[PDB]
Design a protein around this ligand. Structure first.
Ligand SMILES: NC(=O)c1ccc[n+]([C@@H]2O[C@H](COP(=O)([O-])OP(=O)(O)OC[C@H]3O[C@@H](n4cnc5c(N)ncnc54)[C@H](OP(=O)(O)O)[C@@H]3O)[C@@H](O)[C@H]2O)c1
Ligand SMILES: CCc1nc(N)nc(N)c1C#CCc1cccc(-c2cncnc2)c1
Length: 165
């Protein structure tokens, strides 16, 4: 299965100047817990924002150009990225906007962190129809000394039905 994991501020904001316009350590733990020992697929710009491999996970970067870091696996297409993941139960797509756009139609699961911050972005999470998705998990947290905004984790599963001809 293909899953997307993303943190979204107000108005689907996910990025600004190749960074995330917030600081939420609590989201880091949620992200690790849900990606641990799973392959992670990311766009080149997201890779550049990280700057080093994510420990515990098979790192796959999509780029039209040669790779600039031998520690991760570089691919040049969506099908290639999926091919590189091999025979695993869950592929985690971790960003950014362009990559989310391409994978959302193929995904069966969304792991979302809703952040209560009204902040400007230049990158947004792709639009999707809420009627295609079923929320199966919520977990709310107030802001604290380490996290300046309240946030809520959510998991959604894609709605299926019987194929008819
Ligand atoms: N809030 C969150 O959960 C979250 C998570 C991750 C990232 N972000 C944010 O999102 C922003 C970056 O997103 P972005 O949309 O600018 O870039 P991106 O998706 O991270 O990377 C886009 C790049 O990936 C490569 N690529 C994507 N699809 C390809 C394809 N089908 N075939 C070949 N290459 C492909 C291309 O690289 P080449 O130019 O080399 O061809 C393209 O320029 C940053 O602000 C980042 O901080 C947010
Ligand atoms: C942790 C940020 C995050 N949260 C959620 N819920 N979904 C995501 N896809 C992401 C992300 C991301 C890309 C990214 C960009 C910059 C740094 C890191 C990072 C991840 N884990 C440890 N250190 C840095 C990760």
């Amino acid at each position: 299965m293909i899953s997307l994991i993303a943190a979204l501020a107000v108005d689907r904001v996910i990025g600004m100047e190749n960074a995330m316009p917030w600081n939420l350590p609590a989201d880091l733990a949620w992200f690790k817990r849900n990606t641990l020992n799973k392959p992670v697929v990311m766009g080149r710009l997201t890779w550049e924002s990280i700057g080093r491999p994510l420990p515990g996970r098979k790192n796959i970067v999509i780029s039209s150009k040669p790779g600039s870091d031998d520690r991760v696996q570089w691919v040049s297409s969506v099908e290639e990225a999926i091919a590189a993941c091999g025979d695993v139960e869950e592929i985690m797509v971790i960003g950014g906007g362009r990559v989310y756009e391409q994978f959302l139609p193929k995904a069966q699961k969304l792991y979302l962190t809703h952040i209560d911050a009204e902040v400007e972005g230049d990158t947004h999470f792709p639009d999707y129809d809420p009627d295609e998705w079923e929320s199966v998990f919520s977990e709310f947290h107030d802001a604290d000394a380490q996290n300046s905004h309240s946030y809520c984790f959510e998991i959604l599963e894609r709605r299926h039905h019987h194929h008819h001809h």
